[PDB]
């Protein structure tokens, strides 16, 4: 599961 800021 990717980190919180990965899709910013």
């Amino acid at each position: 599961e990717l980190d919180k800021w990965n899709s910013l």
Partner: antibody, heavy 132, light 108 residues
Framework: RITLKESGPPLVKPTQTLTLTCSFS??????????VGWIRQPPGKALEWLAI???????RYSPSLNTRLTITKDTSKNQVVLVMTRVSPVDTATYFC????????????????????????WGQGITVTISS | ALQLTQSPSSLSASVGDRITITCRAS??????LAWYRQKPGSPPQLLIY???SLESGVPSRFSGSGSGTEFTLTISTLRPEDFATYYC?????????FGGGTRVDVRR
């Protein structure tokens, strides 16, 4: 200056519940993108990531400790609490709380996400032993 | 989970030396990697964030490079405060993995 400090009991017995508190200053958990995480360190061992909580109340836990951990924050009292149920002697370690920067903003706009790639300020750590 | 291997595990050195520690990941973590220095009895101190960015207040002798699965920390001129243990951390995947550490002791 940002500062964090861990508090709780130095000693806990097996099967018992451990509650740790992280008190901070210099930042708010209402501030955009900010997180507070917990990392522990058994004597003589490496760092182990436990959990993180963000200003938007988003939460993440260690998949291997997930059924025993609860992380929560009190924005008004600048505190983050970690509760660990049913401990054993292997839970014996130094427990740290740390700050995670949120993204850089320019006129409220997110321009850089590079600073969230680290835990920049750490507390001194609290030592907890688990013996019956 | 994500495997973060540090090399070497232990490193022998003297004051003035240039050293390099590497951190290898089982999958790409992009540039989301941090380096810390931990002296005994103290908490980890951030040196490099986002694989190469120097953190405010950290000496210029610390340097980080690499992206993807290979990362390196370079201390150009070893100072005595540097005899310690170093750690890498990954923050691209949950959970935020830590390396095993690299101990840097005084050579003899």
């Amino acid at each position: 200056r940002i500062t964090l400090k861990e508090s709780g009991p130095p000693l806990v017995k097996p099967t018992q519940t451990l509650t740790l508190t992280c008190s901070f200053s210099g930042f708010s958990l209402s501030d955009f993108g900010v997180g507070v995480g917990w990392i522990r360190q058994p004597p003589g061992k490496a760092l182990e990531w436990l959990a993180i909580i963000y200003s938007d109340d988003d939460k993440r836990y260690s998949p291997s400790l997930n059924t025993r951990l609860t992380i929560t924050k009190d924005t008004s009292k600048n505190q983050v609490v970690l509760v660990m149920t049913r401990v054993s002697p292997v839970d014996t370690a130094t427990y740290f709380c740390a700050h995670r920067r949120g993204p850089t903003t320019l006129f409220g706009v997110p321009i850089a996400r590079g600073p969230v790639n680290a835990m920049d300020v750490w507390g001194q750590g609290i030592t907890v032993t688990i013996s019956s | 989970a994500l495997q973060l291997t540090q090399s070497p595990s232990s490193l022998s050195a003297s004051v003035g030396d240039r050293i390099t520690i590497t951190c290898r990941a089982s999958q790409g973590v992009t540039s989301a990697l941090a380096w810390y220095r931990q002296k005994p009895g103290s908490p980890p101190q951030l040196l490099i964030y986002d694989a190469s960015s120097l953190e405010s207040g950290v000496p210029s002798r610390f340097s980080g490079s690499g992206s993807g699965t290979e990362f390196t920390l370079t201390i150009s001129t070893l100072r005595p405060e540097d005899f310690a243990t170093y750690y890498c951390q990954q923050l691209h995947f949950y959970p935020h993995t830590f390396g095993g550490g690299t101990r840097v002791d005084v050579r003899r």
